[PDB]
C-alpha cells in the first residue's frame, strides 16, 4: 500500500480549491521516482460551494491484478480521510465510471474504469482496463488522475468538503504532474453525476519524457 497527504487550500477567486502534494513511486532498483502534483478545482455550477480552511486528505492506495483478466488492467482499492492541521448524494454506495484519453510523448491510449465509492468509509473500489491495447506508461503513474468527492470528511470537518458541495453539477479538476528529472502530465477532468452515477471524464497530455527514464522505460514497481 501507499500513503500520501493531499494538501488543500481555498481558491476564492475561482470559487474553488487548489492542492499540492508529492507521490513517491517505487523504482524497480530500490529508488524512488517523485511526482510533484499541482491541482486546481473549479465548480461547474454557478452556485455556492464550501471553501475550506487548509487541511489534508490522507490517501491510502492498494494496487492488484484480477487473476482472470488478460487485458492490460489495474484493480485499485483506496481509503481516503480528511484531516485537520451535495453531501446527501454520497450517504450510500455510488457507482463510478472513469473514462480517460491520453497521449504521452505521442503514445495514444484510452482507459475505462468501473466500480463504486462509499464515502461513509472513504472507500473506493475500481477496475481499470486499457481499451486500446498495452498501456504505454506504468499504471501507478495514472492512479491520481483516474474522484475526491469520495473522501471521508469527519463530521467535525464537514463544512470543509468542497468536493461534495459542488455536486451534482460537478467540478473541473486540472493538474500538472512533474516527474522529477523526467517529463510531465497535464490533465483536465470533469467530475459530475450522470443520473445516479458519478463520472470522471479525463484528457491527459504527457510531454518531455525520457525514452529510457522510469516512466517510458517501465521501471516502476506495481504499487
UniProtKB/Swiss-Prot annotation:
Impact noted for substituting residue 112 to R: In mut1.28; shifts fluorescence lifetime from 3.03 to 2.76 ns. In mut2.2; shifts fluorescence lifetime from 3.03 to 1.94 ns. In mut3.3; shifts fluorescence lifetime from 3.03 to 1.88 ns
Protein known as: Green fluorescent protein
Coiled coil: none
UniProt record, GO biological process: bioluminescence; generation of precursor metabolites and energy
Consequence of changing residue 6 to I: In Azurite; shifts the excitation and emission spectra to shorter wavelengths and increases quantum yields compared to BFP
Keyword set, alphabetical order: Chromophore, Luminescence, Photoprotein
Family the UniProt entry places it in: Belongs to the GFP family.
Consequence recorded when altering residue 128 to L: In mut3.3; shifts fluorescence lifetime from 3.03 to 1.88 ns. In R10-3; matures to the red-emitting state with excitation and emission maxima at 555 and 585 nm, respectively
Amino acid at each position: 500500500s501507499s500513503l500520501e497527504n493531499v494538501y488543500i487550500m481555498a481558491d476564492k477567486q475561482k470559487n474553488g480549491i487548489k492542492a499540492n502534494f508529492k507521490i513517491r513511486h517505487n523504482i524497480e532498483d530500490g529508488g524512488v521516482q517523485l511526482a510533484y502534483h499541482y491541482q486546481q478545482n473549479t465548480p461547474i455550477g454557478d452556485g455556492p460551494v464550501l471553501l475550506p480552511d487548509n487541511h489534508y486528505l490522507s490517501t491510502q492506495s492498494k494496487l492488484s491484478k484480477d487473476p482472470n483478466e488478460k487485458r492490460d488492467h489495474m484493480v485499485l482499492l483506496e481509503f481516503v480521510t480528511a484531516a485537520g492541521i451535495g453531501e446527501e448524494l454520497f450517504t450510500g454506495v455510488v457507482p463510478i465510471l472513469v473514462e480517460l484519453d491520453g497521449d504521452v510523448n505521442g503514445h495514444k491510449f484510452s482507459v475505462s474504469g468501473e466500480g463504486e465509492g462509499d464515502a461513509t468509509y472513504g472507500k473506493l473500489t475500481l477496475k481499470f482496463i486499457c481499451t486500446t491495447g498495452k498501456l504505454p506508461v506504468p499504471w501507478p503513474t495514472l492512479v491520481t488522475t483516474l474522484v475526491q468527492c469520495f473522501s471521508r470528511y469527519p463530521d467535525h470537518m464537514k463544512q470543509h468538503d468542497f468536493f461534495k458541495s459542488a455536486m451534482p453539477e460537478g467540478y473541473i479538476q486540472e493538474r500538472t504532474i512533474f516527474f522529477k528529472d523526467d517529463g510531465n502530465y497535464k490533465t483536465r477532468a470533469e467530475v459530475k453525476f450522470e443520473g445516479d452515477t458519478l463520472v470522471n471524464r479525463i484528457e491527459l497530455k504527457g510531454i518531455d519524457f525520457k525514452e529510457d527514464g522510469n516512466i517510458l522505460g517501465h521501471k516502476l514497481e506495481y504499487n
